[PDB]
């Protein structure tokens, strides 16, 4: 009777995406998830899976799945992967080394750029330490680069921690916006609750 497909369109077809520093997470459970139709839903620039074989993803089951989504620029999609470094991986969104899941990305230049420029997608430029896997930093505290405290005011060695992307339609592809959805599969000592059609559960 569990003929309710998992609400993937809610995440993938969301009209607005989050900035990478404030990346969104959607909890998906208690439904059927076929990933073939995902890999056939549109033309994705990136569709990489780690930890489990992308051939028979449908024959697998998990406790629940988490769909994180955000926008970055093209040249940074490579940082959404295990063992990566860079401003995005270090300060914005970090995947673990033993990641088991899939990274899906597509070009959103038609949606997220505009003539004159869209500057409202931001990324974190400064942080005192690197993010642990899947942690999230939404703070806007002035970054104290030096020995003198900032008192919430920008100055030399006192920098606002976020910076705009400049998304214009004619940008080089490396500087065009890309929408990214990361699928994490949680394998917990508990009954499965997300299952593909092709598993013997169904």
């Amino acid at each position, epitope marked *: 009777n569990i003929t309710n497909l998992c609400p993937f369109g809610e995440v993938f077809n969301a009209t607005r995406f989050a900035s990478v520093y404030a990346w969104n997470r959607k909890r998906i459970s208690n439904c059927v998830a076929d990933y073939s139709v995902l890999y056939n839903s549109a033309s994705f620039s990136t569709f990489k899976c780690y930890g489990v074989s992308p051939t028979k993803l449908n024959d697998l089951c998990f406790t629940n799945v988490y769909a994180d989504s955000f926008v970055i620029r093209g040249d940074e999609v490579r940082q959404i992967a295990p063992g990566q470094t860079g401003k995005i991986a270090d300060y914005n969104y970090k995947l673990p080394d033993d990641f088991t899941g899939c990274v899906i990305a597509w070009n959103s230049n038609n949606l997220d750029s505009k003539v004159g420029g869209n*500057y409202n997608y931001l990324y974190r430029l400064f942080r005192k330490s690197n993010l642990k896997p899947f942690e999230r930093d939404i703070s806007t505290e002035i970054y104290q680069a030096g020995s003198t405290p900032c008192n919430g005011v920008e100055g030399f060695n006192c920098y606002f921690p976020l910076q705009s992307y400049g998304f214009q339609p004619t940008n080089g592809v490396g500087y065009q916006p890309y929408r990214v959805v990361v699928l994490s599969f949680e394998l917990l000592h508990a009954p499965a609750t997300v299952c593909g059609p092709g598993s013997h559960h169904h």
Partner: antibody
Amino acid sequence: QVQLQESGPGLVKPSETLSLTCSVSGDSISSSDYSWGWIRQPPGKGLEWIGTIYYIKNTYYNPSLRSRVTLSVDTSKNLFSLKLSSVTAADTAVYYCARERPPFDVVVVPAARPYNWFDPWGLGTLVIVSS
Amino acid sequence: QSVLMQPPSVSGAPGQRVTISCTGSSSNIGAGYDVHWYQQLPGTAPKLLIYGNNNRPSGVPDRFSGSKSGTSASLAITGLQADDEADYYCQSYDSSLSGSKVFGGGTKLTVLG
């Protein structure tokens, strides 16, 4: 319409401090949208950014001049000011003030600062450094 | 001395097309930062000509256009008129060290007479 008017001493002796004042008309220097900047131009040469002040207290300086530059805002007179210490002959220039605005439709103004441009500009005031 | 490199002079006959380049590096124009152009008529203050690579403020005629590509940007002026003789400056942002606005060295445009 926004207009900016510079004012300062025309001549200053070397090692003194140059004090300049820019009066703003048609807008408030207490803006949380616009910033207020100083640019200079040595006679017959190019333009050089000095520094910018935003929302009364936030400052951004040309790194090669930062140790000599002080910017401030006076909300009661709707003006902002530049002080340049220990002037030498290299500081003889026309000094312009300008409004520095962010791109249109920006929610988080401080995050868009690298994409700001200058508009409008003041008339500029010539400062000669000589003893 | 300027971080953005412009040709010192460009010239064209009345009615011709003319371009002024502005080459930076991977720490300014190549890092994704916008290029703005200011026009300085002789004896006058600079004035905004192009903002955000290719946008015209109100009052700037159709004949002025801007673009950017890689580490470079370009100002194009079609239908050259005597009114256009001026010095043109590009300007961007450079993220190296603590970050700073940077200007080109300026280009004197001459309308051949």
